[PDB]
Each structure stands twice: as structure tokens, then as C-alpha cells.
Amino acid sequence: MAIYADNSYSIGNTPLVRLKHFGHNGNVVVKIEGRNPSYSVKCRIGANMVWQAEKDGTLTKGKEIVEPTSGNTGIALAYVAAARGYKITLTMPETMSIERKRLLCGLGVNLVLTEGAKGMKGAIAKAEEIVASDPSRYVMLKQFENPANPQIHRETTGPEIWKDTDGKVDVVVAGVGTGGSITGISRAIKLDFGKQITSVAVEPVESPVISQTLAGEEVKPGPHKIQGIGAGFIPKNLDLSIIDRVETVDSDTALATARRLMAEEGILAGISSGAAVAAADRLAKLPEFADKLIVVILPSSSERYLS
Template sequence: MCANLIDTIGNTPLLHLKRLSAETDCAIYAKAEFMNPTGSIKDRIARHIVEQAEARGDLRKGSTILEVTSGNTGISFAMVGAEKGYRVVIMMPKSVSTERRKIIQSYGAELELLDDLLRIQQAMRASEERAQQDPTIFLPRQFSNPDNPDAHRRTTAREIVEQAGVEIDAFVMGVGTGGTLMGVASFLREVNPSVKIVAVEPAESAVMSGEAPGHHGIQGFADGFIPDIFNLKRIDKVVKVSTADAIAMAKRLARDEALFVGISSGANILASLQVARDLGCGKKIVTTLPDRGERYISIF
């Protein structure tokens, strides 16, 4: 029995994608993060950031959680805020799916829409100014807060090792804040120094590859800059995936693997297939399925 919904976060299954694995003669596994309470991996960081802030006294009764996000993190903070009784204000681009907006508002959070994805950094500066003027505002700062990767080091990474063992040849993950990749990589490298860490980014906004930021449709990836918590030196390889290819793979996952997941999942799987082919047969590749497909129906 769980005391509340927050206690159900994590401990998601690791799925063996048999049909896709057969194409490469490798074993491809995907962590079913869409099974978290709000349907995404971001529940993990929302819970951890809030609980760590409470423990430090940075977040208390009467506080307002104000966060700038391109999507799922806003939903997760809205849920955690509703459970714990905090007012939540989410700033996000107008380009995000209609479903995401409605879900955030359904949890009682307030929504402030930004004109452009590429203006997220401006919104972050604006949120800092608001917090300076109002001491009741708490900023999670997911792009720079070390509690973000720490959440994945403490939970996601350990679950992967428990489920797949230490003999993992590669971990593949798309980069939004970079928290999942940094946190999981930190722990995996301790138990298996030879594991390859692979980052995934949109081909249309390949900032990790040294290209200019641009518009893309892989929501949750690449906000047009490299976050403070992300260290490119810890990455062995960066794979670029186009929005169109990511959407096509997400649709295929529903048909071939019975997994109705989001666009970022399609990107992660495409990159995993490429890594599997590069490494050769018999390897074990682990990735994640970050969220559900329902919140992209208007896009699909």
C-alpha cells in the first residue's frame, strides 16, 4: 500500500524489445518510464527536487513553485505540487502539444506560454528576477540543479543495474536538461567503466554537435543550449535524429512492439538501433521510453 501517489514513482519495468533487437542481433532494452504516475520520466526529478528543497528549508508551506520547461517537467511539478499543496506556475513554449497544456492545467497549475522555444533562456532570466522580488517563489532550476541528475543516479541507474546487470555495453538517451544521461552515466561508469554513453539530439537543433540551435519537434529534447548540469566530456558519442524519423519510429513502436509512446522514445530507439549496428552483434543496449503517446495525438 502506498501513502500517496508520489510513492508510486519509479521502479518501472525494463522491456526487451524483441522485434527491434532481432534486426541488429543485439539485445535492446528500454526502461518504461511512461509508467510513472503522470506518464513520464520527469516525475523522478520533480519529486526529488521538491523533497530536497523541503529538507533544506527552501520550500515550505505557502511557497510557489515556478519553473520554465518545454513540457513534461511542468506536468510532473504540477502533480507533485497538487499532492503537496503548493501553488505551481509553469512557463512553457506555445509550440508544445495541446495535451500537455491541458494536463498541467488539470492539476490546478497556472500556465504562462512563451512565444518561442528558443526564448526559454530569456524566460529563465525572467523567472530569476521574479524570485528575487518575491521570497515565496521557489525555482527548481532543472537545467542547473544538481538534484536533477542525482535523482537518476539514486533511482533510475540503480534500477537499470538491478534489472539488466552490470554488463551493459551502451546507455543511449536523448538530452533535454541532460539530467537522466548524467545521473545514469555517473553510476553505470562506477560499476562498469567500459560502458558507452551515447547522447541523442534533434538533427534540426544539433547544438551538442556544434551546430546552431533551430526549431524541431522532438519535445523534451534540445532547448537550444547546453544545460549547466550536462558535461559533454562524459559522452562517448552523439547521435542526431530528425523529427520526422523520430515520429515514424514512435508510430512503429505502437504497431510492432505494442508500445504507444512519445516522439522522444522514437528518437531514443532509432539512436539505439544505430549504436547496436556500430557496436556489432551480441551487445546489450539500454535506453528509455520517456513518456506516453497520448499527449502527442494532436501531432501524430
């Protein structure tokens, strides 16, 4: 049959490509979630959070979705909302890019601009204000804590890795934003397939809150350029129990790495993709991981060389 009823259903079955200038004897393979509706991993959780809300009764015909993300999740939710016919409001700082404004508005989003000076705090507060005004009408899917986030990764992303590696995957390397990808993928491979792999979270050296937490050191978030990761706290959808190792990468190296993916491998991937690869490459060049297959999530694609 092989026909999809709407674009939300077309998520996943992402590539898997072997790198020739990273790792050791091609030990590093990279996913390419860029190959998705909306061109990011977030298409997966955008789909499943909506689907789950439907099954659960929390989202019905007539209720409206409100979230404050103006990142890849917004575009995911925007596409899904268009595909499934829901009104969405997204709240943004007024100082967000016209490109993203135009894109979200083009997708049929009711865009609500908040005070530049209040930043993301402003947008989040206003989203909660809107919901408070009529809860029976508005639904916020809360990506940092919604279980349907890691669940989609356990049911799709993880099995796809297992399947396309003939169960040979030894290591999974994934930057943490909401923590959903690493969490769901790890549960799939470790619990459902029963292979005791090494799960590796990646985070900015500028904001190493996972490493600080685990080291029992003071948590000290910080500014960084690795868009998509390093939220500055531990999300509820990051399952600390399934993480084996945490690697930090700096913004500069992440940027250089993303450039090399493009110029040396011909893969057009976002800064966070560069962060994850830089981390994977470092472990791939330890003798202990010489005979091991390392799979790296490239969360997004870049429509613009960060140059």
C-alpha cells in the same frame, strides 16, 4: 508494507522490454519511463527537486514554486505540488494548447499567460520577474542546472538498469534535454557499479549542438519537432566527461520510429523515444555492438499517435 504516503514516492521501477524488430538478436532493450506518475521521466526530477528543496530549507510550508516549463517537467511539478500541498505558478506563452492549459489548471496550477510574440523567452523572463518581486516567498527549481536532477537518476534510474540487467548492460542510449538522465545513469553504472559502459547522447540533426561543440565547430541550434530534446545549448546537467558518443537523428526518422514502436512492438512512446531508438538501432547493427546489451530510455509516452 508497500504503501506510498503520496504519489511523489511512487516514481520509478520502470519496466525494461526487449524489442523484436529493432537491433540484432534482441540486443536492444527499452526502458519505458512512460510508466510513471504524469507519464514521463520528469516525474523523477519533479519529485527529487522538491524533496531536495525541502531538506535544504529552500522550500518550506508556505513558500511557492515557480517554473516556466509547460512541458513534461511542469506536469511533474504540478503533480508533486498537488501531492505535497504546494502552490505552484507555471508561466506559459498565451498560445499554448488548451489541453495542456486544462491539464495544468486541473492539477491546481496558478497559470500565468505571457505574450505569444515573446515565446519561451517571455515566459522565462516573467518567471524571474515574479521571483524578483518576493524572493523570500518564491522558489524556482531550475531543471537545467539543479543537481537534484541527475542525482535522482544516479540513485534510481541507473541502479534499476543495473539491477534489471544483472549488470549486463553494455550501452546506454538517451536523448538529451536537460542532460540529467544520461548524466545520472552514467555516473551510477560507471562510478557506483564500476562497469565501463558506452554512454550515448542523442540529439536532433537539426540542432546538433553537442556534436558541434565537441567537434569544435560553430554551435548553430535550429528548429525541430523532437519534443523533449535538443534545447539548443549545453545544459549544466549534461556532464560532457561521462558521454562516450553522440548520435544525431532527424525529426522524420524519429517520428517514423515512434510509429513503428507502436505498430510493431505495441509500445506507445513519444517522438523523443523514436529518436533514441533510431539511434540505438543504428549502433545495434554495427558488428562491434553485436554481442552487447543496449538499453534505450523512452522518456515519455504519447496519448496521441503523431499521425
